[PDB]
Amino acid sequence: SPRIVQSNDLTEAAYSLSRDQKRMLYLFVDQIRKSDGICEIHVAKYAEIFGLTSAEASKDIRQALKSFAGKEVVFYYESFPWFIKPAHSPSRGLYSVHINPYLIPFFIRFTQFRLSETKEITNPYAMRLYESLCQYRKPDGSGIVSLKIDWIIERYQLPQSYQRMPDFRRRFLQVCVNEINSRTPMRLSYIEKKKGRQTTHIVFSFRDI
DNA sequence: CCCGGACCTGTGACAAATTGCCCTCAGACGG
DNA sequence: CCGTCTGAGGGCAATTTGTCACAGGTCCGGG
Ligand SMILES: [Mg+2]
């Protein structure tokens, strides 16, 4: 299946995208890299890739696309918009999109994963976690990395109530660890690092099945 | 000595959002 | 000209995600 690669600057960038938008984003990076910023999406190809109907595919593309407006990207800082013109459909079943050409150098010290690894993940924050572990993966398939909680919150743009740690644990950390273990070929564990009463980092270990 | 207070934890409620499903009907095309 | 495969719309209930009040732990310092 298509091998996604992206600059680490994108893996560690600050943004808030839905699952459907992130799914689309994988195809843009694939299209751009296999070469002005003008990309294209076919309804029927999207449906076959992610096992959706044509109808439900159409709904996902259309609503994802109009939700890009106003979204911004931060590289730690400098902020950019994803799109510089609205999307439009010249033909039935076909969409044309205009990615910000200033984003090109940030797309192409790199991260790589096959698209089948992430296509069953549902929670978008869990897609971001799996991308950040891959950045440190070894050829054989294992790795270990320590991520700071404040940096997790700023990079993944978690909602404000997750600055209370018990909600952070219950609705983000445990769920995203559980999905990865159930939906990817990776087997993931963790332990908490503390300083006084405050929890400051999360330490991730993983191997390949 | 014992307190309220400033921290921390986990859970039960409710509100807001998203999931895969379902149904209708016109466009594009080919045989 | 028409029958079929698409896909652009309109919805749903069942789950998940986002928010906050409340019980219950610790340690410190002033009364
Ligand atoms: Mg959908």
Q: How many CB atoms lie within 10 A of CB A158?
A: 19
Query: Minimal CA–CA distance to A106: which of A40, A38, A29, A30?
Result: A29
Distance CA A71, CA A92 (A): 26
Q: How many CB atoms lie within 10 A of CB A87?
A: 17
The tokens describing A77, both together, are 């800082």
Tell me phi and psi for residue A171, to 5 degrees: -100, -10
CA A75 / C1′ B7 distance in Å: 34
Distance CA A155, CA A157 (A): 6
| b/e code A173-205 from CB counts within 10 Å (16+ = b) | beebbebbeebbebebeeeeeeeeeeeebbebe
Overall resolution, Å: 3.1
Q: List chain B nucleotides near protein: any atom < 7 Å from a Cβ.
A: 7-11, 18-24, 27-28
Distance CA A98, CA A87 (A): 7
Query: Hey, what amino acid is at A162?
Result: Y
CB A97 within 8 A of CB A104: no
Helices (H), chain A: 8-11, 19-33, 43-49, 54-66, 104-107, 124-134, 149-156, 165-168, 174-183
Classify A23 as helix, strand or coil.
helix
Distance CA A123, CA A120 (A): 10
CB A32 within 8 A of CB A103: no
CA A166 / C1′ B12 distance in Å: 14
Q: How many CB atoms lie within 10 A of CB A102?
A: 12
Q: List chain C nucleotides near protein: any atom < 7 Å from a Cβ.
A: 6-11, 16-20
The tokens describing A106, both together, are 């940030």
CB A125 within 8 A of CB A174: no
Residues with CB under 7 A from strand B: A 18-20, 55-56, 59, 92, 122, 164-167, 169-170, 197-199
- For CA atoms A27, A29, A34, A36, the dihedral sign is positive
Cβ burial, residue A51 (10 Å; 0-12/13-18/19+): exposed
The tokens describing A170, both together, are 């219950």
Q: Pairing state of beta strands A143-148 and A198-208?
A: antiparallel
CB A47 within 8 A of CB A53: yes
- At CA A201, angle to CA A197 and CA A207, rounded to 5? 135
The tokens describing A121, both together, are 């993940």
Helices (H), A93-143: 104-107, 124-134
Tell me phi and psi for residue A123, to 5 degrees: -75, 125
Distance CA A98, CA A201 (A): 38
